[PDB]
Amino acid sequence: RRGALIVLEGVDRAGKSTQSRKLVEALCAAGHRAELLRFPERSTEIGKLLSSYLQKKSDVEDHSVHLLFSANRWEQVPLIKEKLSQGVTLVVDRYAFSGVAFTGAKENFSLDWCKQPDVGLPKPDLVLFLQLQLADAAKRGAFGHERYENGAFQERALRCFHQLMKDTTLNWKMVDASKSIEAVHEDIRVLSEDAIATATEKPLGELWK
Amino acid sequence: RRGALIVLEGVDRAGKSTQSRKLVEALCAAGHRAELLRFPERSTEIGKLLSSYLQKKSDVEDHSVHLLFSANRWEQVPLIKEKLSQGVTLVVDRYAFSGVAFTGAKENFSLDWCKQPDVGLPKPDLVLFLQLQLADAAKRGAFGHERYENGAFQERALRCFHQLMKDTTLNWKMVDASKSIEAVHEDIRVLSEDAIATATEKPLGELWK
Ligand SMILES: Nc1ncnc2c1ncn2[C@@H]1O[C@H](COP(=O)(O)OP(=O)(O)O)[C@@H](O)[C@H]1O
Ligand SMILES: Nc1ncnc2c1ncn2[C@@H]1O[C@H](COP(=O)(O)OP(=O)(O)O)[C@@H](O)[C@H]1O
Ligand SMILES: Cc1cn([C@H]2C[C@H](O)[C@@H](COP(=O)(O)O)O2)c(=O)[nH]c1=O
Ligand SMILES: Cc1cn([C@H]2C[C@H](O)[C@@H](COP(=O)(O)O)O2)c(=O)[nH]c1=O
Ligand SMILES: [Mg+2]
Numbered sequence: 001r002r003g004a005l006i007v008l009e010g011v012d013r014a015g016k017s018t019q020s021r022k023l024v025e026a027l028c029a030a031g032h033r034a035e036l037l038r039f040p041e042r043s044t045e046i047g048k049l050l051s052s053y054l055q056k057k058s059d060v061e062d063h064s065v066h067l068l069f070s071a072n073r074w075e076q077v078p079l080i081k082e083k084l085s086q087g088v089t090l091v092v093d094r095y096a097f098s099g100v101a102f103t104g105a106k107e108n109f110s111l112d113w114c115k116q117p118d119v120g121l122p123k124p125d126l127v128l129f130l131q132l133q134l135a136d137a138a139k140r141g142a143f144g145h146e147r148y149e150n151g152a153f154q155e156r157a158l159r160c161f162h163q164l165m166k167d168t169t170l171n172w173k174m175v176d177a178s179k180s181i182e183a184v185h186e187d188i189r190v191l192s193e194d195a196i197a198t199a200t201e202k203p204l205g206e207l208w209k
Numbered sequence: 210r211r212g213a214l215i216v217l218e219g220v221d222r223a224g225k226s227t228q229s230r231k232l233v234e235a236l237c238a239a240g241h242r243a244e245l246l247r248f249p250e251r252s253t254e255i256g257k258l259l260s261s262y263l264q265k266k267s268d269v270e271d272h273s274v275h276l277l278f279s280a281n282r283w284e285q286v287p288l289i290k291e292k293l294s295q296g297v298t299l300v301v302d303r304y305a306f307s308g309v310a311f312t313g314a315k316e317n318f319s320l321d322w323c324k325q326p327d328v329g330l331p332k333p334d335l336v337l338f339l340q341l342q343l344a345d346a347a348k349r350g351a352f353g354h355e356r357y358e359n360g361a362f363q364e365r366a367l368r369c370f371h372q373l374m375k376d377t378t379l380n381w382k383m384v385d386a387s388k389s390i391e392a393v394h395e396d397i398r399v400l401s402e403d404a405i406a407t408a409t410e411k412p413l414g415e416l417w418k
């Protein structure tokens with residue numbers, strides 16, 4: 001019976017990476033086959049160009065870089081489909097919603113244009129959005145030095161995330177990411193176990209189509 | 210007064226590269242400022258991944274590779290816009306129509322999906338399509354060893370080129386590429402001088418939007 005495709009999204013410092021790793025751990029301890037994936041996936045050739053751009057070691061024209069982030073996803077599709085088909089649940093730290101939110105926060109990029117490259121990807125069974133006080137999120141240390149890590153940019157991407165949340169065909173769940181690490185974890189684990197039990201029942205969908 | 214953006218398209222061996230170089234030469238000898246561009250532009254980091262894929266030194270998932278060909282274009286947009294704004298006419302050996310025709314010849318790729326990444330690019334003032342007997346085109350030596358260089362694939366891309374030709378908002382001109390090199394050249398040169406004279410009159414357009 002297939003695994004579920006579970007995505008964690010949220011603004012920076014909302015706890016996506018910590019909860020993603022802890023969810024895989026709890027799922028494996030509850031006897032599921034589960035694995036962690038992340039985007040961008042920095043180890044391929046595309047991913048290294050992307051990693052360079054984000055660290056500001058290089059600049060890349062905005063359209064091209066949007067397309068590189070989408071291709072980075074499509075190159076892992078064969079692996080995603082295979083693992084799900086084998087009953088492995090995949091927990092993914094960011095996906096195409098981050099792709100659309102971060103480019104669409106830039107001037108002159110329509111939401112529509114930014115979604116197209118990602119149309120057709122494996123459609124998540126569950127899209128968790130980790131909500132946190134952008135401020136009460138800055139009290140989570142301090143913006144890193146990477147591109148996009150500043151307040152104003154974060155605010156334009158959060159609006160984009162909110163447009164994408166009006167999709168009713170995507171199973172979006174909000175999570176209050178202000179609680180402790182263990183409490184966020186328990187909320188996430190329960191919605192994920194629920195999605196996994198239903199997933200083995202419907203075919204993997206296609207994103208935005 | 211801006212330069213014109215002139216694109217040459219056609220199936221393999223139709224003479225796109227030879228006519229492109231000869232057109233730039235004739236335009237420069239007639240006192241215009243003109244330069245040659247080609248896609249893919251193999252000297253950037255993206256272009257090297259693309260060059261590797263085409264030579265079959267590497268394989269790349271079909272969606273990702275489509276997106277890489279489009280990003281390769283967008284990374285030269287700043288340069289395209291600047292040169293045109295300075296009165297330099299640009300002669301481009303293949304553009305987004307080849308991008309759409311070659312991926313859309315693959316199974317399960319809609320024309321619509323394949324056009325999106327390229328929506329918004331600098332809109333050619335003149336799109337020359339070099340028509341030639343796919344057969345009478347094989348008498349132009351023999352298919353190279355690169356990807357896509359086979360009859361059946363060429364036939365599916367020619368159908369895609371034909372769908373794209375129903376656009377009425379693109380100034381498409383057919384050229385009979387079966388004649389000699391010098392005769393094709395003279396036909397091309399005259400339509401290009403004509404487009405250059407009108408171009409200095411309307412703003413550079415946006416492709417497919
Ligand atoms: N619920 C939480 N409460 C407090 N600190 C947290 C919480 N979740 C994560 N942290 C810490 O906040 C920082 C950002 O967490 P991280 O998982 O990297 O978030 P993201 O991937 O969303 O940026 C890290 O130091 C992490 O350990
Ligand atoms: N009109 C023409 N007639 C005959 N041979 C031609 C003609 N144009 C080009 N050639 C030759 O055909 C081959 C393919 O031409 P080329 O310009 O590389 O086409 P493309 O870029 O469309 O593949 C080359 O050997 C070229 O010199
Ligand atoms: C997956 C993805 C991430 N991003 C962003 C969000 C973050 O700023 C950055 C990577 O950050 P991270 O290490 O916090 O996950 O890249 C895009 O701009 N496009 C994309 O497709
Ligand atoms: C520009 C472009 C070319 N192509 C193709 C057409 C040719 O097979 C190949 C490059 O060939 P060339 O050296 O004959 O111009 O790449 C795509 O598949 N996508 C694209 O965006
Ligand atoms: Mg993280």
Ligand SMILES: [Mg+2]
Nearest residue numbers: 112116321325
């Ligand atoms: Mg559309």
Ligand SMILES: [Mg+2]
Nearest residue numbers: 225226227302
């Ligand atoms: Mg050529």
